[PDB]
């Protein structure tokens, strides 16, 4: 995915000021726990000028691949190749004959 | 939606026509009229089909429809056209073209006359004042139109060929447009910030030279330059260019006072040079011919007889001796118009003397033929 | 069955160098020729130069990044920095347009005006600004970045109300190469070079010498111990043999300069001498310098040092002797103007430098390679 130029950055919440009003031993572990867990990760991806989350890019690629895969069915590929190859075959027949 | 049997029907009609023409007009006129009717009904059907299909392919509807999903609708309609119409054209056109190559007007005019018989049999109440010859000409022009449609002509590409080539061109166009849709969808990773940064950089440039330097660094040099010189004149790593011998050029002064040309230039018509050269060359030829003649004895030269010889004659004789052995007939030719035959005896110590050196070689005799 | 560098490969290399890029839609012969040898070209360019050859479906491009940028390299149709700024802004605008999208000239002018990053706003009521925009659009159209739906831009010079309908062509996407980091983190163009050569640490010296030789008209000895020139001196023979093998050029080496000459320049190439009149005076000045070795004794580095006054005196002497044969353009112009024009010309060819501080003129040894004179019969004619 490097073309999308991913990049992550942790989102954090300011320590509530009321943490200062010391409570004692029994509560210190919970304050430490909150300090540890409050940090969370985000991912952002540049996609057609917007900076969007992976969900949006996944949906966009789903839609595109669903549409794009429908453009050129294999049978039509074979038909076009055959129709051009037929005129080339006629040219070869005429040159061999000449 | 076209019928895949179009060309099959036309081919069957032409097949029956071939079958009857092989029987050589030994049947009734009604059969001939029915055969012609089937043939040209089907051919006009195909003609309408190709007109409509080529209009569809060329359609500006397609040209504006490229810019949307509607092109997909156009793609489906076009692939249906190819699958029903052109595939039959390809499968049946070869045999049709062959049959039409067989059947010219010559193989048909009696059949035309019997068609005319049946036409007279029809109680046409129309404005039928056109002579029987007019009916003949109508049928002939119709059949010539068919022959041109398939086989074409030595001066024009057939209708079949033009149709096929336009079809191939359109197929390439449509596939390339699908490629373009892929390109449009994929690449979008805009660089706008880079370009605006670059404009900011450029505006900071003081003068043109700085801006050009920056452009070279950013986009890359748009070209390269070099000095023109006819030869690697120098080889000395230790001498500064000033102290070395320079390369001298002839600057054309930029005044008509001397010369300046844009329209076609003139030449010298140097006939006097050519006259002098011709006369000198022919004089040399004549003098060499005489030097050869100087030693002629009763129409031949025998080396042993020669006392002292011009070095040039020695070289000419050696040339003749060498050339003679190459040709099995031992005949030789000379620029003097003299055929020369060379016979060699090789048991001899004979000296051919001149101002320089005494050449010992095997004796020879030289006959000269009558160039008359 | 293996490929070899042959006439086709040499021709392809020259075509790659002397153009910015080759377009399939317009140069099908050249595109086909280049592609067939593209394997050998890629190998050779990577090994010796280090340039990245970009081969694509629609175009082929050689990212000619110079060793040290020089004035002549830049887009020549442009004459002021503002032209470059408008060009870059126009590109930025085209990034906002989808392929084959059509926009009016007024929209492009408006967007350029809005984005234009200078402190001083871009204004269309002026003549000079409109002329700058027309030059920018002409260079854009030259690279087929934008196609023209019928109209006329030249009228924009004298009619600001002019209008045109333009079409963004696909090539706009690929025009500008890619940059190492988030390019915005850089602060000056010089930082770009330090990157582009961070990828070529392997045998940086050979690639350096080859790039200088092939790109620049000449390669001047920086000082007595210039490493590039020392390299060339050490491998003169094999360098010459390789260059002769792989291209039309033939190497020359002197005490203070080295350059590649070309014997039979094809149509599309640029070379010295050429038609422009300023070259004539350059050749005459070269001859005049040859004629007074004691007065213009070159210093050890091969430079000849002259002040603006001394140069103007030399130009006056030339106008006296050969001025009768100069083009009427110079014959009618004062000495200082001729000095400025001649010095611009000689700058383009790296013949000389204008010292930044002292305004001292340095005429480089490359000038002495060639000398020119009028035919003796005219010179005697000039006496009459």
Q: Residue B268 carries which DSSP code?
A: -
Residue holding tokens 């153009």?
C19
In this complex, the chains that touch C, judged by 3 or more CB pairs closer than 8 A, are B
Q: Which positions ≥6 away from C81 have C-beta within 8 Å?
A: B202, B203, B204, B205, B206, B207, B208, B210, B211
Chain C residues within 8 A of B63 when measuring between CB atoms:
none
Question: Do you know the residue count of chain C?
Answer: 384
Answer yes or no: are the C-beta atoms of B158 and B152 closer than 8 Å.
Answer: yes
- From residue A17, alpha-carbon distances to A22, A34, C149 in Å are 11, 13, 65
Phi, psi of C152 (to 5 degrees): -160, 115
Q: Encoding tokens for residue B156?
A: 């024009």
Q: Which of A5, A48, A84 sits opposite B168 (nearest CB)?
A: A84
Of the residues B67, B185, B189, B198, the best mutation for testing chain C's interface (the one with the most C CB atoms within 10 Å of its CB) is: B198
Is B180 in contact with C170 (Cβ distance < 8 A)? yes
Tally Cβ neighbours within 10 Å of residue B261: 9
Method of determination used here: cryo-EM
The DSSP bridge partners found for residue A7 are A44
Tokens of C270: 């640029």
DSSP class per residue in C307-355: -HHHHHHHHHHHHHHTGGGS-HHHHTS-HHHHHHHHHHHHHHTTSEEE-
Q: Is C226 on the interface with B (CB under 8 A)?
A: no
Q: Does B144 touch chain C (CB under 8 A)?
A: no
C245 close to B (CB below 8 A): no
**Interaxial angle between packed helices A74-97 and B159-186, expressed in degrees from 0 to 180 and rounded to the nearest 10:** 140
Which residues neighbour B45 within 8 Å (Cβ) at sequence distance 6 or greater? B6, B9
Evaluate whether B300 touches B338 at the Cβ level (below 8 Å): no
Chain B hits for C265, CB-CB cut-off 8 Å, are 226, 228
- DSSP symbol at C47: I
Cα dihedral C135, C137, C138, C140 sign = positive
Nearest to B200 among C69, C78, C117 (CB): C117
Pairing of strands C270-272, B225-228: parallel
In whole angstroms, how far apart are CA B253 and each of B212, C19, C364, C377, C381? 33, 32, 26, 11, 11
Q: Which residues of chain B does A90 touch, with a Cβ-Cβ cutoff of 8 Å?
A: 94
The residues pairing with C115 across neighbouring beta strands, listed in sequence order, are none
User: What sign has the CA pseudo-torsion C323, C324, C327, C331?
Assistant: positive
Which of B215, B223, B255 is the closest to C84 by Cβ? B215
Reduce the DSSP state of residue C356 to 3 states and report it.
coil
Q: In three state form, how does the secondary structure of C265-292 look?
A: CCCCCEEECCCCHHHHHHHHHHHHHHCC
Contact, C261 vs B228, CB < 8 A? yes
Query: 36-55 in B: which are within 8 Å (CB) of C?
Result: none
Residue C261, class by beta-carbon neighbours within 10 Å (0-12 exposed, 13-18 middle, 19+ buried)? buried
Cβ separation of B196 and C92 shorter than 8 Å?
yes
Concatenating the DSSP letter of every residue in B93-162 gives: HHHHHHHHHH--STTTHHHHHHHHHHHHHS---S---S-HHHHHHHHHHHHHHHHHHHH--SSS--HHHH
Put simply, whether B171 touches A (Cβ < 8 Å) is yes
Kindly write down the DSSP assignment for every residue of A28-49, as one continuous string: HHHHHHHHHHT-EEEEEEEETT
Cα–Cα distances (Å) from C378 to C277, C325, C326, in that order, read 17, 9, 12
User: How many whole angstroms separate alpha carbon C306 and alpha carbon C119?
Assistant: 39
Class of residue C324 by CB neighbours under 10 A (exposed 0-12, middle 13-18, buried 19+): middle
> In angstroms, what separates the C-alpha of A2 from chain B's closest C-alpha?
11
- Mind telling me how many Å the CA of C102 is from chain B's nearest CA? 12
Q: Which residue of B has its CA nearest to A75?
A: B79
């Amino acid at each position: 995915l490097t073309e999308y130029r991913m990049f992550e950055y942790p989102e954090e919440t300011e320590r509530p000021e009321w943490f200062s009003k010391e409570w004692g031993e029994y509560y210190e572990p919970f304050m430490n726990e909150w300090n540890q867990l409050q940090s969370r990760r985000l991912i952002l991806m540049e996609y057609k000028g917007q900076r969007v989350s992976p969900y949006f890019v996944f949906t966009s690629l789903e839609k595109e691949l669903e549409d794009q895969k429908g453009w050129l069915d294999e049978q039509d590929r074979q038909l076009y190749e055959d129709i051009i190859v037929n005129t080339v075959g006629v040219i070869l027949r005429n040159r061999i004959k000449r | 939606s076209l019928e895949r049997s179009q060309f099959d029907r036309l081919f069957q009609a032409i097949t029956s026509l071939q079958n009857e023409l092989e029987n050589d007009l030994n049947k009734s006129a009604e059969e001939y009229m029915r055969i012609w009717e089937d043939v040209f009904r089907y051919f006009q059907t195909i003609r309408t089909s190709t007109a409509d299909y080529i209009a569809y392919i060329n359609s500006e509807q397609t040209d504006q429809r490229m810019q949307t999903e509607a092109f997909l609708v156009y793609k489906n309609q076009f692939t249906t056209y190819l699958r029903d119409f052109i595939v039959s054209l390809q499968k049946t056109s070869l045999q049709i073209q062959h049959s039409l190559s067989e059947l010219t007007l010559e193989r048909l005019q009696h059949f035309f006359q019997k068609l005319i018989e049946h036409r007279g049999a029809i109680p046409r109440l129309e404005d039928v004042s056109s002579s029987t010859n007019d009916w003949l000409t109508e049928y002939e022009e119709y059949w010539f139109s068919l022959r041109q449609w398939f086989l074409g002509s030595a001066v024009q590409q057939s209708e079949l060929d033009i149709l096929q080539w336009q079809t191939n061109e359109m197929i390439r166009r449509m596939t390339r447009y699908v490629q373009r849709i892929g390109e449009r969808q994929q690449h979008f990773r805009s660089r706008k910030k880079d370009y605006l940064q670059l404009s900011k950089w450029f505006v900071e440039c003081r003068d043109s030279e700085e801006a050009h330097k920056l452009s070279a660094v950013v986009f890359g040099s748009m070209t390269i330059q070099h000095l023109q010189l006819e030869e690697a004149t120098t080889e000395n790593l230790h001498v500064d260019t000033w102290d070395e011998a320079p390369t001298e050029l002839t600057i054309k002064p930029r005044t008509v006072r001397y010369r300046e040309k844009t329209k076609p230039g003139s030449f010298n018509s140097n006939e006097q040079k050519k006259k002098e050269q011709r006369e000198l060359y022919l004089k040399e030829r004549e003098q060499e011919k005489k030097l050869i003649e100087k030693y002629m004895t009763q129409g031949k030269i025998t080396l042993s007889a020669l006392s002292t010889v011009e070095p040039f004659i020695r070289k000419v004789l050696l040339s003749w001796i060498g050339k003679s052995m190459a040709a099995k007939n031992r005949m030789v030719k000379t620029d003097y118009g003299l055929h020369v035959k060379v016979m060699l005896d090789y048991e001899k110590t004979i000296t051919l003397q001149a101002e320089d050196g005494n050449l010992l070689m095997p004796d020879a005799t030289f006959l000269f033929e009558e160039t008359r | 069955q293996t490929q070899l560098f042959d006439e086709k490969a040499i021709q392809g290399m020259d075509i790659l160098f002397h153009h910015y890029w080759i377009l399939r839609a317009e140069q099908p012969e050249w595109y086909q020729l280049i592609r067939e040898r593209e394997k050998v070209l890629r190998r050779y360019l990577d090994e010796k130069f280090g340039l990245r050859l970009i081969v694509h479906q629609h175009f082929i491009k050689l990212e000619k990044i110079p060793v040290e940028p020089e004035g002549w390299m830049g887009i020549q149709d442009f004459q002021e920095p503002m032209d470059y700024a408008i060009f870059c802004c126009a590109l930025a605008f085209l990034e906002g347009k989808a392929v084959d999208e059509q926009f009016l000239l007024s929209e492009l002018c408006q967007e350029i005006q809005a984005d234009y990053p200078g402190d001083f706003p871009l204004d269309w009521t002026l003549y000079t600004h409109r002329k700058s925009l027309i030059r920018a659009v002409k260079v854009l159209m030259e690279f087929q970045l934008i196609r023209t739906i019928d109209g006329d831009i030249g009228r924009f010079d004298q009619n600001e109300e002019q209008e045109v309908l333009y079409e963004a062509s696909t090539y706009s996407r690929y025009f500008m190469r890619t940059y190492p980091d988030d390019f915005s983190s850089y602060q000056h163009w010089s930082e770009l070079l330090k990157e582009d050569w961070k990828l070529n640490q392997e045998d940086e010296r050979r690639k350096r010498v080859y790039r200088k030789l092939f790109f620049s008209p000449g390669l001047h000895r920086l000082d007595q111990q210039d490493p590039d020139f020392l390299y060339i001196r050490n491998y003169r023979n094999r360098l010459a043999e390789d260059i002769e093998k792989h291209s039309e050029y033939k190497l020359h080496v002197y005490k203070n300069t080295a350059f590649l000459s070309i014997a039979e320049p094809r149509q599309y190439q640029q070379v010295f001498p050429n038609s422009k009149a300023s070259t004539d005076i350059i050749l005459q000045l070269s001859k005049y310098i040859h004629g007074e070795p004691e007065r213009f004794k070159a210093n050890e580095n091969g430079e000849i040092l002259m002040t603006e006054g001394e140069f103007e005196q030399v130009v006056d002497d030339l106008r006296q002797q050969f001025g009768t044969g100069w083009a009427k353009y110079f014959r009618d112009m004062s000495t200082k103007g001729i000095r400025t024009e001649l010095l611009r010309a000689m700058k383009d060819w790296m013949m000389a430098e204008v010292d930044s501080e002292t305004s001292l003129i340095r005429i480089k040894s490359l000038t002495g390679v060639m000398t020119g004179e009028y035919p003796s019969d005219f010179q005697t004619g000039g006496t009459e």
